[PDB]
Design a protein around this ligand. Structure first.
Ligand SMILES: CC(=O)SCCNC(=O)CCNC(=O)[C@H](O)C(C)(C)COP(=O)(O)OP(=O)(O)OC[C@H]1O[C@@H](n2cnc3c(N)ncnc32)[C@H](O)[C@@H]1OP(=O)(O)O
Ligand SMILES: Nc1ncnc2[nH]cnc12
Lengths: 719, 695
């Protein structure tokens, strides 16, 4: 009979949790242990983990409401919101990093949000924020806590219109002196707001407002939803936030998942507002058959609300751990550099061809060809895609470049068949398929791009590379009506807001035209952006077919003919050098038309090539619009050292902006680069980075001392 | 001439706009105080131009000698809100200078102007009339290039590359343009052919350099919207960067038939090898941009367009961080609010806001008669966004349409199976568009306008259906929260009379979201609760509990209940009685369900809201105008004091600042009386001022 203690017996709560299809909240810490363990297996199997590599500390409020640490038997939570402070030693943080886990106890009042759960959830968020560590939220709730005064139930009355016929209706509810007394025989007068009265022989205290002695019935909870809605809203711009939906999320539940932005949905676990049964009655019909139709994975994932989906709670936890490996340990710390086995010093194997279609992910991480492995731009097996089920025109995810973490955005060259499911509420609604052309921003892909730039920026504080390859925005009616202009603008706002280095880069077979260029041009945020174009990329306000349709028309094509074709030329002269007889002019005009009707194609071809010669990177360098043109196969090596140099100098600027007399970026960049010895030329990225890194110790000193002179000069002289 | 050109375009000639502003300004007065006779210098417009150092400077010159396609004027006019005058610059595209194209210079000038406005904190108006980014080819290489055919005979069989002769090469050297093409010498039979590797041109503004400029200003306008009041009028057409410029400025009035697009119908039909679109208006006309919210407003023509810009400005400050422009008017603050909603029949939230004329007289609304200036009225009509004055105090106001919206949607021309679809949007419920409109308004009221705000909250919650959820309603609702967090002025949330605020709706407008600026108030005739009664009984007062209530308040039902449990009868007897138990339940159930509803409703009252301390006070509609006028005025005054304070060598926290201030008042002042506190502060701005510097 079970060789070991049945845990669902020792703690029935655990069984209720399992009965509702989710993990028992006090069992989630172990799930994070298991995932952190795998993190190491997948990175270095010969590593031997002790037991102190993972530490989970439960946090509960003390008397002054200050969260402290407590070790105690699970199932002892007085409120339905629990929290843990994890501090685990991971590959990118051998000495360990820390984060907090906030979770609804789904067994406690079905995970409902009451004033206490709310204030606790808020108290925890500020705990993380003040420390700068990530805030993980496991959501499994039933929303705001509802209720009625159960004390007024057993004793209210009905001022009927006609006592002997209740059907005729009533006029008001009230309590008898008896009831009015029954309340104090327990001290619950506040439970109601009455108004004295007498009648055909009796007392009548009409109820004007039922309030209830119990806390957590209505608006006070609503008040608490808002405290935490704005708290998360704020946290997202301050620390790495992320929510995992483990059973379901309703009301502020569905709003907290979104406000935290990054969200992982376990399949079968709905994210909803008002439930299907409620909607059905509302609509007076049996329209929906399951909450999944409202907030299931085919909605929230295809929608973009859920950045990822997981088959079960453990899978979802492993995805949170994986996501964190890219983020800094705490706010304002250098990005977690984890050198893999895929050295930076190598060529880039897979290369596109302006013919055969390709998956942009190949360029990103590589291809597993039937004859070996073609390495991509980034570290082998490092790409961690996100928002994969929404706006597939774009490809966003995290990655590592020579061990350096960064956000990556690519363009999907293949046409996406976005299939929209019919609306059950509309008897004559039809499943419909939208075809989204590759290399073109649509309302959804623009918004997605914006979302990604913002998520790399706010909590992750990451560098980012955009393999820009857009022919523009869709300008057709439908997409203009769907406000592609608004989502397109969001892109600019996101880049202006970005605080880490940005690399824009038109890849090989790529191009970046009119509308698309304006939203990614370095000038938008000169401080962090830089653009590069592959020697084999293209760029211009219009495409040749377009550029020609306006500045290389027929007449012009013909002028080129008369100048470059002997037959057409000599023919032109005969029609304009001598007065010919009608019969002869006709005879020759025909020979003209037929010649035009034979060279025209080739010549039209010639004009395109003329146009395409301006759309070259060489011109980009010439006009000073990019920083450099590059050799694709050499990109990895090049960017590896450009990012590392950029990052290294940025870290120095930030320090040189923590003291007193704030100076312009320029000056800080001056002061810094004068620290370099003649033996290292500024223009050399690998020369600078290596330098800064080899002297961090020394540098650290120079900066600290720089502050001392300040915080002691303004004082020494403050006479 | 120039004028004629511009008029062929359908727009007004650039140097004729100031005259239009002038005309509109004189109107403001005729509307304000008729009998006034402005003097020619009540308005002053100076054209701005670049100088040696490139630094903008004012000048007076020939209305038409601009060397670029971007023009700028510095308006300075005396208005009703600013008698001693207010300022603002106006940048525009010269539609006759290369079709308002954006060459690198038009760009760096525009950017230059924007920063000029941003540094002085003054509004930046933009008149859009352009063809987008400038395009061109190295025209000097067209008569000089050669084709190395596969076979000079039968040229139709291809070519290998373009080059320049030894001559053409000298043709460039001569006219000092040897830098128009990057080339590479070759050794064919006869002489050398410079193989064209890439063309550059001698003229500037042919491609990418143009795009750079486009970007530079895209981020410049993006930045300006968060720094100064920005607005733009679409006078002729706006293409590409022009259209992105209209959006990035956020505020936009669109002149009818003046399209805003990214690519013309021609290019697109061409793009789809078929005659899809007939007009550019189908792509960016007011039926497109106005209905979708990109164009807050539309004007019949340029003058009307400019008028609306001037009317919009009468609500915003003169320069960044300037006290909102108070403008007391005929309709004084001390009066009751007339129009009142009635759960019975339907109403228009506007009547509540601006009053309505009745076949008896003018029923005054909550705000100053005639001061409502609605915007974004062609998009998401579930919400009513606008600006008005409360006893002269300007402020953004958001109300809720209670009447169903019949959203009509045009078929898609490029999809031959498309059909005009009519989506009905129910009242008092957020949908993706209305939630989005709500956040946009809050964002626009806060960024350049810097206005206080009152939201007459009346929402059953968000749409939970599949469609509205599939369409991301969850994303736009959250936008609202972010907008409130960012708010920098005083906010007032007021659940109006026949109104309510439930589970999902209440969470995005709670005062705790931004304790520093918000406050909530509920009418004594309003409702609130996580669930609506129907929903509450649905869970907490079901069939069973209902029966338990019948068995307690209905004598015969208990009689019957008793018999079946206090004596043990014969089969036929137990059957008969059980039957009559049912007949009784199917008689009272209805009216008893009514009771459970009433029972639930008594929990959703403002009194409980006060009891719980979730609102500030319950109020009476008719008496709201009076209450709010002094609460706002009062808070405006304390905020003023909060800033003058904070601004010192020890900045503390709200609670603290607001407490060192309130500790300055006379001990006899009631920190709870708004009129008295405002009155005192105003009577002591200097006395208060002295004390400040006294630290
Ligand atoms: S914006 C969102 C605003 N909020 C809402 O729409 C919440 C409405 N409620 C719901 O959607 C449902 O309660 C769900 C989906 C959360 C849960 O499943 P349901 O099948 O409806 O609830 P179920 O019938 O299983 O009720 C289980 C118990 O929890 C209680 N309960 C339900 N909702 C709540 C709540 N919000 N707070 C506290 N208790 C609750 C019920 O009264 C019931 O108690 P009982 O067994 O003593 O009668
Ligand atoms: N934007 C533009 N610039 C220059 N010439 C053009 N011809 C048509 N559109 C143009």
């Amino acid at each position: 009979a079970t060789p070991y203690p049945v845990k669902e017996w020792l703690q029935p709560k655990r069984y209720k949790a399992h009965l509702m299809g989710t993990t028992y909240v006090y069992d989630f810490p172990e799930l994070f242990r298991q995932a952190s363990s795998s993190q190491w297996k997948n990175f270095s199997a010969d590593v031997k983990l002790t037991d102190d590599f993972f530490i989970s500390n439960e946090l509960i409020e003390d008397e002054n409401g200050e969260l402290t640490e407590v070790e105690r038997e699970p199932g002892a939570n007085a409120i339905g919101m629990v929290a843990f402070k994890i501090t685990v030693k991971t590959p990118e943080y051998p000495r360990g990093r820390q984060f907090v886990v906030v979770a609804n106890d789904i067994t406690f009042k079905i995970g409902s949000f009451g004033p206490q759960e709310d204030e606790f959830f808020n108290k925890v968020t500020e705990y993380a924020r003040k420390r700068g560590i990530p805030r993980i939220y496991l959501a499994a709730n039933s929303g705001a806590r509802i209720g009625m005064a159960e004390e007024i139930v057993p004793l209210f009355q009905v001022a009927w219109n006609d006592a002997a016929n209740p059907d005729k209706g009533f006029q008001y509810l009230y309590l008898t002196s008896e009831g009015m007394e029954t309340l104090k025989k327990f001290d619950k007068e506040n439970s109601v707001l009455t108004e004295r009265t007498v009648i055909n022989g009796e007392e009548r205290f009409v109820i004007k407002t039922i309030i209830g002695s119990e806390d957590g019935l209505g608006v006070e909870c609503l008040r608490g939803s808002g405290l935490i809605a704005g708290a998360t809203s704020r946290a997202y711009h301050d620390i790495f936030t992320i929510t995992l939906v483990t059973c379901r999320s309703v009301g502020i539940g569905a709003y907290l998942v979104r406000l935290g932005q990054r969200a992982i949905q376990v399949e079968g676990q709905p994210i909803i507002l008002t439930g299907a049964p409620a909607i059905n009655k509302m609509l007076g019909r049996e329209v929906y058959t399951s909450n999944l139709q409202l907030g299931g994975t085919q909605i929230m994932y295809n929608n973009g609300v859920s950045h990822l989906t997981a088959v079960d709670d453990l899978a979802g936890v492993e995805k949170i751990v994986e996501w964190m490996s890219y983020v800094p340990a705490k706010r304002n710390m250098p990005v977690p550099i984890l050198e893999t086995k895929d050295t930076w010093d190598r060529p880039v194997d897979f290369t596109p061809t302006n013919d055969e279609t390709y998956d942009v992910r190949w360029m990103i991480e590589g291809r597993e060809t039937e004859s070996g492995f073609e390495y991509g731009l980034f570290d082998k097996g490092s790409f961690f895609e996100t928002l994969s089920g929404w706006a597939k025109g774009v490809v966003v995810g995290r990655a590592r470049l020579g061990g350096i973490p960064l956000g990556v955005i690519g363009v999907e060259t293949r046409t996406v068949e976005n299939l929209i499911p019919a609306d059950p509420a509309n008897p004559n609604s039809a499943e419909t398929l939208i075809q989204e052309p590759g290399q073109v921003w649509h309302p959804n892909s623009a918004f997605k791009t914006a979302q990604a730039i913002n998520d790399f920026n706010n909590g992750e504080q990451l560098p980012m590379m955009i393999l820009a390859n857009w022919r523009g925005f869709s300008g057709g009616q439908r997409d203009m009506f769907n406000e592609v202009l608004k989502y397109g603008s969001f892109i600019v706002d996101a880049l202006v807001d970005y605080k880490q280095p940005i690399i824009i880069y038109i890849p090989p077979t790529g191009e970046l035209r009119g509308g698309s260029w304006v939203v990614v041009d370095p000038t938008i945020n000169a401080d962090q952006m830089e653009m590069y174009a592959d020697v084999n990329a293209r760029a211009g306000v219009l495409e040749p077919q377009g550029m020609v349709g306006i500045k290389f028309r027929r007449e012009k094509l013909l002028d080129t003919m008369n100048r470059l074709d002997d037959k057409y030329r000599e023919l032109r002269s005969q029609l304009s050098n001598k007065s010919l007889a009608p019969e002869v002019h006709q005879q020759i005009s025909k020979q003209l038309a037929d010649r035009e009707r034979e060279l025209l194609p080739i010549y039209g071809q010639i004009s395109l090539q003329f146009a395409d010669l301006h759309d070259r990177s060489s011109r980009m360098v010439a006009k000073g619009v990019i920083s450099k043109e590059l050799e694709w196969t050499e990109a990895r090596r090049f960017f590896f050292w450009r990012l590392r140099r950029r990052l290294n100098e940025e870290y120095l600027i930030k320090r040189l902006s923590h003291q007193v007399g704030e100076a312009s970026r320029l000056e800080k960049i001056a002061r810094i680069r004068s620290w370099y010895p003649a033996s290292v030329d500024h223009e050399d990225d690998r020369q600078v980075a290596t330098w800064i890194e080899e002297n961090y110790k020394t540098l650290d000193d120079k900066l600290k001392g720089l502050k001392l002179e300040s915080f002691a000069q303004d004082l020494a002289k403050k006479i």
